[PDB]
Coordinates of C-alpha atoms and ligand atoms in Angstrom, one line a residue:
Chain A
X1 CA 0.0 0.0 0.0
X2 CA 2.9 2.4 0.7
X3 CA 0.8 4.8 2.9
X4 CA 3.6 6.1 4.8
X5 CA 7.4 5.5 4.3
X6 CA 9.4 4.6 8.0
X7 CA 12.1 5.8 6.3
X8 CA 11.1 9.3 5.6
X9 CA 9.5 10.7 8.4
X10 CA 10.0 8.8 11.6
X11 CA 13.2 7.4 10.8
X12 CA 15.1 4.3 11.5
X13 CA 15.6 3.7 15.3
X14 CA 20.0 2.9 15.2
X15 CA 19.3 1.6 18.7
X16 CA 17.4 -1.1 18.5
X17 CA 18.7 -4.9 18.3
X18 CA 18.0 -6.1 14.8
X19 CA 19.5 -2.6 13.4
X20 CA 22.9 -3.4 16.2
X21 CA 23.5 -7.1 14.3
X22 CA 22.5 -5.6 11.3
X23 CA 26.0 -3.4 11.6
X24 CA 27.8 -6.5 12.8
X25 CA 26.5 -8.7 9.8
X26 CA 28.1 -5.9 7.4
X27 CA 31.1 -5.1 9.6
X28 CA 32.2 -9.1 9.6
X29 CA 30.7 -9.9 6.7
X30 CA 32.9 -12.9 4.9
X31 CA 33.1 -13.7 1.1
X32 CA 33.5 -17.3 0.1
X33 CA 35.1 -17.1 -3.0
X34 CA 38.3 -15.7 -0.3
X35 CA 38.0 -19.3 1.3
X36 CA 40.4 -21.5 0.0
X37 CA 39.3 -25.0 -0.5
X38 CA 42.8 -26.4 -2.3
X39 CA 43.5 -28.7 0.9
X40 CA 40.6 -29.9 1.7
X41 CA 40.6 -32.1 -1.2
X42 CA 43.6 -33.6 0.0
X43 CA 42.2 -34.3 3.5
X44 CA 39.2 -35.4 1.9
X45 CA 41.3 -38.6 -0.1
X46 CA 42.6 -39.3 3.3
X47 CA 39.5 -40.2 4.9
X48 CA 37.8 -43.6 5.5
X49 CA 34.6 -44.4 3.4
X50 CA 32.7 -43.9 6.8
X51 CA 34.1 -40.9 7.4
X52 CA 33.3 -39.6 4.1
X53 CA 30.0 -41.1 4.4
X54 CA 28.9 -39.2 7.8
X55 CA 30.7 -35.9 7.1
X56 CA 29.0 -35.7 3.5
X57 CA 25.9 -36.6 5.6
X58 CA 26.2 -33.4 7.7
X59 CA 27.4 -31.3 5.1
X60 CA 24.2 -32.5 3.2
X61 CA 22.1 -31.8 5.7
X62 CA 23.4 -27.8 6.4
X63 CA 23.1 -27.2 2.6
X64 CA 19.8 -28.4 2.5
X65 CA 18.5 -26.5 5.3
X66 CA 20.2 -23.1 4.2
X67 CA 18.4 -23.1 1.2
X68 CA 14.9 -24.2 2.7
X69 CA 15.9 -21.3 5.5
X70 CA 16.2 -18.7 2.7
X71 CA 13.1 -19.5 0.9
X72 CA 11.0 -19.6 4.1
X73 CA 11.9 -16.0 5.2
X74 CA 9.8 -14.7 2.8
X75 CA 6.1 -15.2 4.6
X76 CA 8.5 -13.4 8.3
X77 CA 9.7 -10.7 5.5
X78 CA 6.0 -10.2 4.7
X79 CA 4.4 -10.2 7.7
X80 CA 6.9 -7.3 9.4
X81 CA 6.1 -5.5 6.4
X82 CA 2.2 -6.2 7.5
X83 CA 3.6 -5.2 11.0
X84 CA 5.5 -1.9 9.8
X85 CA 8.7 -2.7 11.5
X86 CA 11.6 -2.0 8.6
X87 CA 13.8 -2.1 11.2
X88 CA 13.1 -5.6 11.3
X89 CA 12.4 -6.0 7.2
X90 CA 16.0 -4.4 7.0
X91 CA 17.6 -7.2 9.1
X92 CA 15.9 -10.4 8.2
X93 CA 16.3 -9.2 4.8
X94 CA 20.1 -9.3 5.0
X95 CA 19.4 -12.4 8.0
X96 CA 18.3 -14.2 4.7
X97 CA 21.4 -13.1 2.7
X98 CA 23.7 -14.6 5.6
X99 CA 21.5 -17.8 4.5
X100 CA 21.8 -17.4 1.4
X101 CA 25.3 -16.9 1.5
X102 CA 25.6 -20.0 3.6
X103 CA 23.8 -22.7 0.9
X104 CA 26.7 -21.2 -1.4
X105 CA 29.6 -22.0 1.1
X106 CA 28.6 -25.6 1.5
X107 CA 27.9 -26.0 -2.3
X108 CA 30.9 -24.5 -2.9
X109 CA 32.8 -26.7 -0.4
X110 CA 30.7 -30.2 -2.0
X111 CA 31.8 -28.8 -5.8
X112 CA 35.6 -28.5 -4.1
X113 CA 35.6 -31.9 -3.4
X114 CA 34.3 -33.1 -7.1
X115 CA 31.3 -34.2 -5.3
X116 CA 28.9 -34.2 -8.3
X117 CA 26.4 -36.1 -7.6
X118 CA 22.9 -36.2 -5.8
X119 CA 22.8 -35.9 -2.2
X120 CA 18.7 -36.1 -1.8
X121 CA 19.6 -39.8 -0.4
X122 CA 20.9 -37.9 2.5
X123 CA 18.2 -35.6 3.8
X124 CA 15.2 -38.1 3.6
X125 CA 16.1 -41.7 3.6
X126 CA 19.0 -41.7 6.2
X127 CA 17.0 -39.4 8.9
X128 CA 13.5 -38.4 8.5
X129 CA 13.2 -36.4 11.2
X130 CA 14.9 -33.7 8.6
X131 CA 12.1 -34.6 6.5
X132 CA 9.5 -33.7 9.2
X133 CA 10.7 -30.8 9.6
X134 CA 12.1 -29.5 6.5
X135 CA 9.8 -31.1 4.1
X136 CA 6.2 -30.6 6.1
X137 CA 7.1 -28.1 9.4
X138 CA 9.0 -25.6 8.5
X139 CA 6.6 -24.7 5.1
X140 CA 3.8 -25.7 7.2
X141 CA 4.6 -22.7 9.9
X142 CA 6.3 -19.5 7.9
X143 CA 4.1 -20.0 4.9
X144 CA 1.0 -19.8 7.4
X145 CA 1.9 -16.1 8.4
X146 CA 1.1 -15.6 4.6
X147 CA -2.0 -16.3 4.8
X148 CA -2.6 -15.3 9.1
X149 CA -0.2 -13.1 9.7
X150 CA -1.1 -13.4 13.5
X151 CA 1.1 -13.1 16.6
X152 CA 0.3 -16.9 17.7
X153 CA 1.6 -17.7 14.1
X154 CA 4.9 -15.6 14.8
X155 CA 5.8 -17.2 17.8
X156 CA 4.5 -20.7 16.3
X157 CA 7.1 -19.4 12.8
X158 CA 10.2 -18.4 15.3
X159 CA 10.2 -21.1 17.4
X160 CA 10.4 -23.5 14.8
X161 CA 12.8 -21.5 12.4
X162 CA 15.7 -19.7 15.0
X163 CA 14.8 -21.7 18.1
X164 CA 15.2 -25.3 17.6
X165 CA 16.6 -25.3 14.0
X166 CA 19.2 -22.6 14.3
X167 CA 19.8 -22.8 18.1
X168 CA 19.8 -26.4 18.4
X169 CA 19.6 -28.1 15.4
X170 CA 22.4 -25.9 13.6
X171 CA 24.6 -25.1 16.4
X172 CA 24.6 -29.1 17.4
X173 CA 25.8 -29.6 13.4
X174 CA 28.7 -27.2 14.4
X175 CA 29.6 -29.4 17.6
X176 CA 30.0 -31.7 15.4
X177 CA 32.0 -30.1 13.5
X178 CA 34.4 -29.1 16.2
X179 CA 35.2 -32.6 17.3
X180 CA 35.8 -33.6 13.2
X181 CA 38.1 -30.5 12.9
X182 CA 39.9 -30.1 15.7
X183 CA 40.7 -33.6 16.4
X184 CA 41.7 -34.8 13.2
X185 CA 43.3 -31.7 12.3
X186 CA 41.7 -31.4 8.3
X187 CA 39.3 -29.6 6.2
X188 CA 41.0 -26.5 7.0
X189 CA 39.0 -24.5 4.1
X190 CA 35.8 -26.0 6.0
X191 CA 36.9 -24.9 9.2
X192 CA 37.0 -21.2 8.1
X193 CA 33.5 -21.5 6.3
X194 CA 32.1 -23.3 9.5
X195 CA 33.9 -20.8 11.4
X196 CA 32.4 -17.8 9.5
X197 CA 29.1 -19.6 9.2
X198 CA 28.9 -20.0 13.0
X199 CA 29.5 -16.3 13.8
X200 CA 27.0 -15.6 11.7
X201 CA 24.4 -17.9 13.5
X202 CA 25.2 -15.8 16.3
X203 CA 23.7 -12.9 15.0
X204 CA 21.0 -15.1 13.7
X205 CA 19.8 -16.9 16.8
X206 CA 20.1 -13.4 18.7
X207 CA 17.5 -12.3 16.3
X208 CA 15.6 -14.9 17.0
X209 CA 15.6 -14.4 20.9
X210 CA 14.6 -10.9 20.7
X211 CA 11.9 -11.8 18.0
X212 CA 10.0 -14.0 20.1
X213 CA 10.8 -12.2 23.5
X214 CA 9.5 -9.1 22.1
X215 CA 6.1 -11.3 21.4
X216 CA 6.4 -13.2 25.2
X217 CA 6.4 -8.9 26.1
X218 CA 3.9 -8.1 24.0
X219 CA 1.3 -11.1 24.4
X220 CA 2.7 -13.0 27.5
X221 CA -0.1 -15.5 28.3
X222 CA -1.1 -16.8 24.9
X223 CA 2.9 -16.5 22.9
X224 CA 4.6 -18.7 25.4
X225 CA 2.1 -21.6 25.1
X226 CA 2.3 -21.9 21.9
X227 CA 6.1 -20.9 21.7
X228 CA 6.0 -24.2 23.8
X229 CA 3.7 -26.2 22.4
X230 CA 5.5 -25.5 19.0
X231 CA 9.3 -26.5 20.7
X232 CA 7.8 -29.3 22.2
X233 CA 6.4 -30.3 19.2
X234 CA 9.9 -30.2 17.6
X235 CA 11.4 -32.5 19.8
X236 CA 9.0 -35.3 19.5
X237 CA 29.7 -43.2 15.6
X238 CA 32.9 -41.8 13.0
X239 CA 35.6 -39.2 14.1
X240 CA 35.6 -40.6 17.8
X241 CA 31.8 -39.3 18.2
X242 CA 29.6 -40.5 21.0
X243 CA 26.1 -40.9 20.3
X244 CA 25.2 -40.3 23.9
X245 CA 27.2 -37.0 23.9
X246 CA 25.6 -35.7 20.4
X247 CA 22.2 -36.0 22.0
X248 CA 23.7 -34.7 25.0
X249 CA 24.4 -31.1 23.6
X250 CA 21.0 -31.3 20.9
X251 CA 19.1 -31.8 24.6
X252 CA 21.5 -29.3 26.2
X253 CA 20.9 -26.6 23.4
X254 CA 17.0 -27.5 23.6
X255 CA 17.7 -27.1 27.6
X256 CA 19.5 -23.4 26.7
X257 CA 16.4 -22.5 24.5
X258 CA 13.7 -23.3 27.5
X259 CA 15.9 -20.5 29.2
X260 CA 16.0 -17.6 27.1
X261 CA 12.3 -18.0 26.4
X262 CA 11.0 -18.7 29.9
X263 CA 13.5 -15.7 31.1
X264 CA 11.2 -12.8 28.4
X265 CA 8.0 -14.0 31.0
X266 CA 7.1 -11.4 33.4
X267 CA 10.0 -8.7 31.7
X268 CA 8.4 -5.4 31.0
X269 CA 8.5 -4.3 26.8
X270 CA 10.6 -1.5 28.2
X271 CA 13.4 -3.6 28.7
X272 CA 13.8 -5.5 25.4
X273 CA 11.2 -3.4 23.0
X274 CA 12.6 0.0 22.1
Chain B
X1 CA 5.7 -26.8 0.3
X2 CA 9.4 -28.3 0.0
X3 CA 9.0 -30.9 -2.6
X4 CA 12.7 -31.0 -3.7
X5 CA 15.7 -29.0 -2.8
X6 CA 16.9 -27.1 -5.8
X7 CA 20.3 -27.7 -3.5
X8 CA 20.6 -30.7 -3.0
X9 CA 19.5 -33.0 -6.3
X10 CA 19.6 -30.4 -9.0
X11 CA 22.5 -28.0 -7.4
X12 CA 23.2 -24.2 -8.1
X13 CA 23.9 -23.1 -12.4
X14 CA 27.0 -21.1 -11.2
X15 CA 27.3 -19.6 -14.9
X16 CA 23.9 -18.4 -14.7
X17 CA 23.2 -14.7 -14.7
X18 CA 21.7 -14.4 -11.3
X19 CA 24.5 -16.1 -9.9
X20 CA 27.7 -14.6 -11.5
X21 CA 26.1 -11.0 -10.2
X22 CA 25.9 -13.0 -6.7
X23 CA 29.4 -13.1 -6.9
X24 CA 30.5 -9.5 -8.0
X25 CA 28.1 -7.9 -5.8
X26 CA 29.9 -10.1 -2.5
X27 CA 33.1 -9.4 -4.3
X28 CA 32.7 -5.8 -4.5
X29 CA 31.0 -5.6 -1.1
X30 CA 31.1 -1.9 0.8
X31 CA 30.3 -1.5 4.6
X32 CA 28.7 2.3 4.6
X33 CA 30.6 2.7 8.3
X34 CA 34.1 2.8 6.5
X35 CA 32.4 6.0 4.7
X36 CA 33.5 8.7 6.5
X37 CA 31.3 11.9 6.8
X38 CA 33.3 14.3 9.0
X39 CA 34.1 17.1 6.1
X40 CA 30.6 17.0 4.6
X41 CA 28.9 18.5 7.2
X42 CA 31.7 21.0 6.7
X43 CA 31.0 21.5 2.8
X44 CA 26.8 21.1 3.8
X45 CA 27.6 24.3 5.7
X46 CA 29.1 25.9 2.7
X47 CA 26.4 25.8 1.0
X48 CA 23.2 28.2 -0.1
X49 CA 19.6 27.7 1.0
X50 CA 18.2 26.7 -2.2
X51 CA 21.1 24.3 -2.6
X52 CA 20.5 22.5 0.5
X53 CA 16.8 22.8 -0.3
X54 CA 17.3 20.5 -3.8
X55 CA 20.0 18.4 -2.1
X56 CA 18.4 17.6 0.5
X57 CA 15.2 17.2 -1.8
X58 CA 17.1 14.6 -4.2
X59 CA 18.3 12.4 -1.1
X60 CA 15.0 12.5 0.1
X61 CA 13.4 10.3 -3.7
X62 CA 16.2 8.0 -2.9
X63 CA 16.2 7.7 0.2
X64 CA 12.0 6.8 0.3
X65 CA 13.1 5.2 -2.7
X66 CA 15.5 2.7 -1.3
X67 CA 13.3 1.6 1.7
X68 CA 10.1 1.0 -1.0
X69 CA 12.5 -1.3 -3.3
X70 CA 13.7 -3.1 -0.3
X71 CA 10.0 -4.0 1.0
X72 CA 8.4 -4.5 -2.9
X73 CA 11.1 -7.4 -3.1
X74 CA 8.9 -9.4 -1.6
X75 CA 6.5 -10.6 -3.7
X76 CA 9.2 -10.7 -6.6
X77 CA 11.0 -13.1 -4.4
X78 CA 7.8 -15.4 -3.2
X79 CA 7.0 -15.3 -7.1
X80 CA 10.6 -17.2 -7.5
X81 CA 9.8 -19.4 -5.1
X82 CA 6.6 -20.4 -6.9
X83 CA 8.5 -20.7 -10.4
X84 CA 11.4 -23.0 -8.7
X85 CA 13.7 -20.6 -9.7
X86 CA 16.2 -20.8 -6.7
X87 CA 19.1 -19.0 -8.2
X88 CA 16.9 -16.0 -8.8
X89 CA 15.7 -16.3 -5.3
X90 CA 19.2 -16.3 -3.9
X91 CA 20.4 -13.1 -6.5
X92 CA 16.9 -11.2 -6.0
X93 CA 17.4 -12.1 -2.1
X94 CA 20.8 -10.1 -2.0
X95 CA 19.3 -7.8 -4.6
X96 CA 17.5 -6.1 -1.9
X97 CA 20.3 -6.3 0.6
X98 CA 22.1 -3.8 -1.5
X99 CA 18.9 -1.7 -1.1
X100 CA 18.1 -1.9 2.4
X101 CA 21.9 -0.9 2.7
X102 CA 21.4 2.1 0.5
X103 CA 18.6 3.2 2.6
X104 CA 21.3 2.9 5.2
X105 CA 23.8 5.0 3.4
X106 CA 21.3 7.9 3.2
X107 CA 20.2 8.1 6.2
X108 CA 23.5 7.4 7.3
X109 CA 24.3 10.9 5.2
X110 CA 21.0 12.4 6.8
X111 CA 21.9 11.8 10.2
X112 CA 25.9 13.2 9.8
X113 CA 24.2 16.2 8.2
X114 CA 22.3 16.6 11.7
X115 CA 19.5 16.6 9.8
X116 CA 16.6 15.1 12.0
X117 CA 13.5 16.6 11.0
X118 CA 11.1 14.8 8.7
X119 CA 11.4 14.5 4.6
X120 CA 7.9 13.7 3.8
X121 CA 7.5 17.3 2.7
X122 CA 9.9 16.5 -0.2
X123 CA 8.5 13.1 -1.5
X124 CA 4.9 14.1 -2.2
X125 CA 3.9 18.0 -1.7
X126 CA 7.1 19.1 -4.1
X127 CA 6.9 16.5 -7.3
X128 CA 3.8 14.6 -7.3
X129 CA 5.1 12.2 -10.1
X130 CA 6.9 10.5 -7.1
X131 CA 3.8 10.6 -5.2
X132 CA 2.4 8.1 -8.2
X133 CA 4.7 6.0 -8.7
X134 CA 6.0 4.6 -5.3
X135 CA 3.2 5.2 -3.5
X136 CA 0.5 3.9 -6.0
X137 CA 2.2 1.8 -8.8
X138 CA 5.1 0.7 -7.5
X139 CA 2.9 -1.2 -4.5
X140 CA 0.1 -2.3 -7.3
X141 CA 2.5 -3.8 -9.4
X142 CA 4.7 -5.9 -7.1
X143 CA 2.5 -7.1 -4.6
X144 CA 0.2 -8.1 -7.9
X145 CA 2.5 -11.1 -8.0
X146 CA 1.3 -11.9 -4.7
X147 CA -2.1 -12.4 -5.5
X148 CA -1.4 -12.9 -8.9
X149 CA 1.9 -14.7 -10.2
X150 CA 1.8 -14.3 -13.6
X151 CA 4.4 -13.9 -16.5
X152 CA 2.8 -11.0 -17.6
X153 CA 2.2 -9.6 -14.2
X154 CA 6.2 -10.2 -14.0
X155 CA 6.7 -8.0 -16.5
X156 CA 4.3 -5.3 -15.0
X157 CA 6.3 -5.7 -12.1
X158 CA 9.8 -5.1 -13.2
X159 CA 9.4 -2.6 -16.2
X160 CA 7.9 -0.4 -12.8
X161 CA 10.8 -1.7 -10.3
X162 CA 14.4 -2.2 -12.6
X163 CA 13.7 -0.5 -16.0
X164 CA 12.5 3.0 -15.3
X165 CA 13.0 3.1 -11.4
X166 CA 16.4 1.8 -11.1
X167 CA 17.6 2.3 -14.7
X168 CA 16.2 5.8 -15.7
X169 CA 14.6 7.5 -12.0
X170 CA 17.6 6.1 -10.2
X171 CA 20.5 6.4 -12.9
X172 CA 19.3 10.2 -13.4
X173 CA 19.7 11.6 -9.7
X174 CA 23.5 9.8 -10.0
X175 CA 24.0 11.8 -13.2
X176 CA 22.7 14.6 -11.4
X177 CA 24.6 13.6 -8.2
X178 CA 27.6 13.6 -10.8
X179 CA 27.3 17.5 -11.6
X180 CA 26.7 18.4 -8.2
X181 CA 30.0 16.5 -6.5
X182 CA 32.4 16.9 -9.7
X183 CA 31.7 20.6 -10.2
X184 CA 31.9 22.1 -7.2
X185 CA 34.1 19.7 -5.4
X186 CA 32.0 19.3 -2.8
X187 CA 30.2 15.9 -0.1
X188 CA 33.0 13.3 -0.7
X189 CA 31.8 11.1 2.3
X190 CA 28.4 11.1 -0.2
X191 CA 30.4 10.8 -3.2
X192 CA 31.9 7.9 -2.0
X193 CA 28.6 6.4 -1.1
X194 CA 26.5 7.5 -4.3
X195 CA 30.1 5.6 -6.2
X196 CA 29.2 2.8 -4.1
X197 CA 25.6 2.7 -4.7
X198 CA 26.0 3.4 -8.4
X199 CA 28.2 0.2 -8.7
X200 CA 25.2 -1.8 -6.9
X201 CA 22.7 -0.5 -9.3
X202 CA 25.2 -1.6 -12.1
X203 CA 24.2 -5.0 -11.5
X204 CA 20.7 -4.3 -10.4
X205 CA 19.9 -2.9 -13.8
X206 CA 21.6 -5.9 -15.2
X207 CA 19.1 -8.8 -13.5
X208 CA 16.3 -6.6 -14.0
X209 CA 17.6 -6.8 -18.1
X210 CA 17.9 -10.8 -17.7
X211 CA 14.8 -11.1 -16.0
X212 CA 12.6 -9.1 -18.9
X213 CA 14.3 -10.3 -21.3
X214 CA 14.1 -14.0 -20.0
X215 CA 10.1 -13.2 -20.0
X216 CA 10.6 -11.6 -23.4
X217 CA 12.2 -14.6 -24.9
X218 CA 9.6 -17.7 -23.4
X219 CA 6.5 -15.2 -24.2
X220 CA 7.6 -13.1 -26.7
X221 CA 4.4 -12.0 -27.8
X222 CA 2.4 -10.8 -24.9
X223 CA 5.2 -10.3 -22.5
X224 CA 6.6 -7.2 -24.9
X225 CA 3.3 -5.2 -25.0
X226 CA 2.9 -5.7 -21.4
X227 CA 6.3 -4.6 -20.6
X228 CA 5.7 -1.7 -23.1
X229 CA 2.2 -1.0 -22.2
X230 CA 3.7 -0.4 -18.5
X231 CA 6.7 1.6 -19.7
X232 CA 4.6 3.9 -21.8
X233 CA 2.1 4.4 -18.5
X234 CA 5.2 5.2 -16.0
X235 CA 6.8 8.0 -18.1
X236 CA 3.0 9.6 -18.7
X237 CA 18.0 24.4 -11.2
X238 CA 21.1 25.0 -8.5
X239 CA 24.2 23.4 -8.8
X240 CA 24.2 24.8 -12.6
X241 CA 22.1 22.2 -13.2
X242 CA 19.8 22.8 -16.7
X243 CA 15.8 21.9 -16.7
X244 CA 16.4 20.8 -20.6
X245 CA 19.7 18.4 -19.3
X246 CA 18.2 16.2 -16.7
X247 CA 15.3 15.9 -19.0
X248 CA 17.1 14.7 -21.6
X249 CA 19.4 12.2 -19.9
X250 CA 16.3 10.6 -18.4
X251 CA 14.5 10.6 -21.9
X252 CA 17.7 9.2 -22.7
X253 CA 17.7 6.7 -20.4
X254 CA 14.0 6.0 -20.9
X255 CA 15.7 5.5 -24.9
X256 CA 17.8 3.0 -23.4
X257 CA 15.6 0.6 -21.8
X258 CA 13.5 0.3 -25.0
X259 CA 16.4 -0.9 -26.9
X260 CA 17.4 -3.3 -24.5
X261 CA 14.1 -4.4 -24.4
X262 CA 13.5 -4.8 -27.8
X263 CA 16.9 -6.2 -28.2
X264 CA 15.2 -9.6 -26.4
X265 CA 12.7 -9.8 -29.5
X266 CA 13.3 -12.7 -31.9
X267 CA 16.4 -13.8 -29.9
X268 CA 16.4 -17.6 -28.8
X269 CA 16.0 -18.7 -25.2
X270 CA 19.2 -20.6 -25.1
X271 CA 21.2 -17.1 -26.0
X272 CA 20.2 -15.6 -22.4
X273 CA 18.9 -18.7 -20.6
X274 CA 21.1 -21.4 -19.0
Ligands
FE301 FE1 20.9 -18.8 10.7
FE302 FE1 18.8 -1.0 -7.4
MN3_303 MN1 22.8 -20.8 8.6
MN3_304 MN1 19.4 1.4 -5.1

């Protein structure tokens, strides 16, 4: 509609947290092509076939989320523009680009290694779980705030989206990939990207917290059930890994979520909201 | 819906359009907080009223201009969703974080100016044309694909986004903002920003070109009058700046978006696609 430009008259509000990470996202912002990948194919002949097996696995698993993650900010784009904060339309617009920037790296890293073939057997056969949520949740939930762009929805959109998939789900990925990397000592061009990609979920799960603490400040009561209901939801070895330590951290990350979104209860909207 | 990951069976066209401007627009990446603005508020002091008055009016269409682009990406991008077209999605993704950081720039420019009153006084009340455009057509036409995601609704959208707003409205206030910087040596923080955001528009002019002419080539017929239809409905001093100059660069410019559009005609898909 275009009735009234933030921009123009009220301005844009410096202070506020998704303009702060918006500066940090440009001020370390990372280019892939600068990554070298020239011995990581080396480290990659020197690896077992089950090595190869589970760390293509993982890789598959990233790439295929950080395209589905940058195709799914749309309906959160839209609905902020529903909601009037730019602010917020000026940071998950470039929170997408981080994404986007992100299905590159790992598509870079997988054409560095001559991998040329399909990796669909990866993200569906070995572990549906990343179907259930990929394939059937994550549509299901941001492409509802297309059509109800309601708070309930946001919180529902969020929880699913930067909660559990880039606070737990991601960040138990990158566990992983600090025991492969630092243990084994290869993948060195990975170990930048991962390292660069990681920083960047920083900003990205920090967005996330204040997203849906802003709606636990804003509707209390009715957000944090369904901010529940929707985590709760969620939830229900190579390179020296231990499967009872991988679900350790996964539990321990969904453990550090419950936190942050228990601690925006009873916290006045002075204190995160402007 | 998440069918199929473009990512992880098909993979990303790295020669394709979209993409290799993915690359020079990372590659040529420009954080507006290296932009220094300490001597322009020096040379803004320097200068007369009615100078300020038509700078300051000029920054203000881009400037309203840069925020509307950033939040009319929207439907553009859900429309590439819709056609599968992933590598559009992730090119017309950072296409509007180049955007969103031009609307940083300028009121980056604003704000070091001390300026901190309100600017709606200069995108409506002094040229109504602007008025029209962004607040009336530029809204109808891209959020048309929203309810609406046709080819010819596509071509609606861009002729009214990348042809006349980015490659004639936007490409004559640089040509103006070249007259006003070069001749009287004058606002290099801004001159290094309007270089900067020039060099973004570069490549934004040149998607916008592949994506007409990629409509103009798989429906030649009806896509053309639709794009031209559009065109023809969009187009009806200090500084030693001339009335008859900046009219004729923009008719100018105008001139050289309909040869580039009729250079698509009788040209065969496989010479601009894939
Ligand atoms: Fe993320
Ligand atoms: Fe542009
Ligand atoms: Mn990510
Ligand atoms: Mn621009």
């Amino acid at each position: 509609i275009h009735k009234k430009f933030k921009a123009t008259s009220v301005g844009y509000d410096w202070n506020t947290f998704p303009m702060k990470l918006y500066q940090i996202g440009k001020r370390l912002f990372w280019d892939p092509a600068k990554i070298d990948f020239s011995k990581d194919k080396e480290d990659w002949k020197k690896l077992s076939k089950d090595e190869k097996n589970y760390l293509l696995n993982i890789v598959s698993l990233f790439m295929a989320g950080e395209e589905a993650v940058a195709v799914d900010i749309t309906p959160l784009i839209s609905t902020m523009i529903n909601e009037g904060r730019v602010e917020d339309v000026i940071y998950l617009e470039q929170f997408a680009f981080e994404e986007a920037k992100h299905a590159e790296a790992f598509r870079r890293f997988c054409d560095s290694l001559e991998i040329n073939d399909d990796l669909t057997i990866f993200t569906t056969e070995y572990n549906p779980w990343y179907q259930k949520i990929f394939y059937e949740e994550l549509p299901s939930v941001m492409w509802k705030l297309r059509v109800d762009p309601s708070p309930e929805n946001l919180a529902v959109a969020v929880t699913t989206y930067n909660l559990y998939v880039e606070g737990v789900a991601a960040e138990s990925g990158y566990k992983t990939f600090k025991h492969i990397f630092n243990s084994l000592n290869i993948m060195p061009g990975l170990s930048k990207t991962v390292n660069l990609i990681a920083t960047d979920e920083s900003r990205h799960i920090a967005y996330g917290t204040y997203l849906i603490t802003r709606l636990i400040v804003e509707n209390g009561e009715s957000i944090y059930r369904k901010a529940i209901e929707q985590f709760n939801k969620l939830v229900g070895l190579p390179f020296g890994l231990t499967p009872d330590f991988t679900i350790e951290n996964r539990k321990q990350l969904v453990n550090a979520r419950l936190t942050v979104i228990e601690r925006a209860l009873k916290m006045t909207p002075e204190q995160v909201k402007s």
